[PDB]
Structure 1
Amino acid sequence: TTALVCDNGSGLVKAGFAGDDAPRAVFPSIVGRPRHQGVMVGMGQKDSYVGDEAQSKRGILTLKYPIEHGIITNWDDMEKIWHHTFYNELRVAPEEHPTLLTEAPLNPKANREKMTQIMFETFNVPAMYVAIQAVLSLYASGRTTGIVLDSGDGVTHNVPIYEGYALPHAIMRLDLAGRDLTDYLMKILTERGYSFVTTAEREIVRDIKEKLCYVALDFENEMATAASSSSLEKSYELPDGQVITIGNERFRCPETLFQPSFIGMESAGIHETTYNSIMKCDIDIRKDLYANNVMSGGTTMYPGIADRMQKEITALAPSTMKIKIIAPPERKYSVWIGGSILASLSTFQQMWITKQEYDEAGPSIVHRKCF
């Protein structure tokens, strides 16, 4: 039947059918459990709330993310995410439907082993596949070659692909993404007197970062502009009705992506990571990687990231090469969207991992078959 594309990202699960333009069910992957005393009998008090129901009732819940930095820590919570996105949101029967899945590169293998075991035993599909996210982003961009900087909620990885071949040795992974920016904004919001310590306040600080933050083209001149006058200050209404005001912290928070020495990480920013990922490749293919920089993931939706990325890469590279940043407006779901390209292909019917191959070879055929 119609295949299922279910991007199980670190922050947001995006699920939907094959060949569709937009994902049908986009919801954050949280598991909420109550911490106070339930005094009213009856009333449908479930012990756990999954997805948007935990977001709506987050004042009395402790929210746990089942995925941290691309590695699934809690597996029963991940089974609750998979049951919620199979039965509640999508409302299908997964025993008669193929289901493609995405995975970050440079992952531990036992995460894929347990994903294969859960998807073939508890949620037993006729067929499944595990695909690299940057290959799906390059498929959604339409081109065959190029280097993808994919930054979800936990994993920021540069993967170059030449002629459809994903090169393994130049894959550069940095563990700095939107949850670290959310925790850094929670740290630096205490300079003006605003305290955010709970997990329910993390969604408020995440919404503040999602709505009010931007990447400066020059950091020092924008810092001097914010220090000289209050022409950059923006206000926000808290859900209890209070109003906060922020100045330079709209651009100090995504400066961690271009300067990771603020939070203590020794490794450099994403432009030097992209330059070192390109310079690890051959010298004959770099011109196809200098002008085919495709950005994807929800972290790359600041309105200054393409100009600052192009300026820093053109400052790093020799000047006689073309620098181009492919920044589509639908990049935030594009990791899903190219999967809808991949599940609609005629050639992909032989590449499915069936139940008979699993029963023949254990959960070990997914390492040999998938890249």
Structure 2
Amino acid sequence: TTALVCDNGSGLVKAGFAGDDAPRAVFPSIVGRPRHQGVMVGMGQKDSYVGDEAQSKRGILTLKYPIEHGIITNWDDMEKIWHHTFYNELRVAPEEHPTLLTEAPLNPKANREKMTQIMFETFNVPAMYVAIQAVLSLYASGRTTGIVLDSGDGVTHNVPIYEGYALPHAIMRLDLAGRDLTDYLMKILTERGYSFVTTAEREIVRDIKEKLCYVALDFENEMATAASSSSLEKSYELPDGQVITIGNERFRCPETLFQPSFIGMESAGIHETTYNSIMKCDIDIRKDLYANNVMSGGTTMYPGIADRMQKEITALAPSTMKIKIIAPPERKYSVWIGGSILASLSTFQQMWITKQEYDEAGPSIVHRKCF
């Protein structure tokens, strides 16, 4: 039987089959509800719109994210996301197809418990697995050793692996990713005059961030360049036809990833997080983590981030070590591609959490069987 990989990220659900190269169904994880009064009777008036339909009719909908910082808050909304991504996107029956899910490290355990219980009682499977995203990213990079910075839409985590042995005391989680960048861009877009308050306008500011934003190599020189001349300014067309023009806010929005104190967080940026995750490891393997800095996630999809990361780690590391940022062009879907490796591996077939094991051991086998 062919398997399913369903990366339930905070922003974008990426679901599809096993053995494929690209994910079949990429759609954002929002649940929309109508907030006005319907006057036309009938017309297929649904009480809820899930996914890209909620992207389409978004001017009359309140959009709720079921996932915040890797932790599923609303569980009926997550059931609606899973029902949509099984029955509408893929059009599959989960009773005859295995499923691998991805999970951030340092997650609360009851999230995994309710994920296992919904996947075994509501959408009950022959088998399923819950894995760590950084192991799948290092699978898709094609190497055995390396440190992975995975930054989705809620969770930025650094996990180092040497020779297939992960070090659990060096795992570093930071709750700063693209949704906080979207909220900070909504905060700083009001400086120029453009106001975005609703949940519908969050998608517009997210589209502005996806199309126009980039990581600056030097923040002070780019701020002096944007203050001096209007060469870095770019224009964008809104859905109502109005045209906006933004300047330094193209690079101030991803600069929260290297300076969290803009949004009031005490913790350091991603480069010192990666450097402290390197320095928490044992002393022999650090050189083998210095040359294999694998990036993944959509938030590392800016076209300035690899050279900035190389500059900051080269500033932090000793000078006699080679810093090599592994940045593949397909790093956005890469965790899914790692699942398409790991579902296809012949040695993984004994590592399924079967239904008989769940019915024997309760919902307690998921802690001792997984990581």
What TM-score comes out, normalization by structure 1 length?
Answer: 1.00
What is the correspondence of 1:81-100 to structure 2 with a 5 Å cutoff? 81-100=81-100
Q: Deviations over 1:308-341 (max 9, x none)?
A: 1000000001000010000000000001001000
SS at match of 1:262: helix
CA shift, 1:233, in A, is 0.7
Distance 2:124 2:267 in 1: 41
Distance 2:85 2:216 in 1: 37
Q: Deviations over 1:222-261 (max 9, x none)?
A: 1000001111110000100000000000001110001111
Distance 1:255 1:194 in 2: 21
Q: Deviations over 1:259-288 (max 9, x none)?
A: 111111111110000000000000000011
Distance 1:230 1:142 in 2: 42
Distance 1:97 1:227 in 2: 56
Distance 1:195 1:243 in 2: 14
CA shift, 1:165, in A, is 1.6
Q: Deviations over 1:62-89 (max 9, x none)?
A: 0000000000000000000000000000
Distance 2:158 2:15 in 1: 24
Distance 2:190 2:203 in 1: 16
SS at match of 2:262: coil
Q: Deviations over 1:12-51 (max 9, x none)?
A: 0000000000010000000000000011101000000000
Alignment correspondent of 1:349: 349
Distance 1:195 1:340 in 2: 42
What TM-score comes out, normalization by structure 2 length?
Answer: 1.00
- In the TM superposition, structure 1's runs of 4+ consecutive aligned residues that sit over 2 Å from their partners are none
Distance 1:328 1:152 in 2: 16
Distance 2:188 2:237 in 1: 18
Q: Deviations over 1:87-138 (max 9, x none)?
A: 0000011101101110000000110000010000000000000000000000
What is the correspondence of 1:23-102 to structure 2 with a 5 Å cutoff? 23-102=23-102
Distance 2:190 2:54 in 1: 27
Distance 2:33 2:74 in 1: 14
Distance 2:338 2:166 in 1: 15
Distance 2:67 2:263 in 1: 21
Distance 1:312 1:18 in 2: 37
What is the correspondence of 1:141-290 to structure 2 with a 5 Å cutoff? 141-290=141-290
Distance 1:279 1:148 in 2: 14
How big is the alpha-carbon RMSD for the aligned residues of Structure 1 and Structure 2? Answer: 0.5
Distance 2:44 2:223 in 1: 52
Distance 1:118 1:41 in 2: 35
SS at match of 2:23: coil
SS at match of 2:295: strand
Q: Deviations over 1:191-240 (max 9, x none)?
A: 11100001000000000000000011100011000001111110000100
Distance 1:166 1:201 in 2: 41
CA shift, 1:166, in A, is 1.8
Alignment correspondent of 2:329: 329
CA shift, 1:167, in A, is 1.2
Distance 1:47 1:168 in 2: 44
Distance 1:193 1:109 in 2: 44
Gaps in structure 2 of 5+ consecutive residues: none
CA shift, 1:366, in A, is 0.7
Q: Deviations over 1:140-196 (max 9, x none)?
A: 001011000000000000000111122110000011100000000000001111000
SS at match of 1:261: helix
Distance 2:267 2:348 in 1: 38
Distance 1:345 1:324 in 2: 28
Gaps in structure 1 of 5+ consecutive residues: none
SS at match of 2:123: coil
Distance 1:242 1:121 in 2: 49
Distance 1:166 1:89 in 2: 35
Aligned length: 371
Distance 1:82 1:260 in 2: 33
CA shift, 1:353, in A, is 0.3
Distance 2:110 2:243 in 1: 47
CA shift, 1:55, in A, is 0.4
SS at match of 2:310: helix
Distance 2:233 2:18 in 1: 44
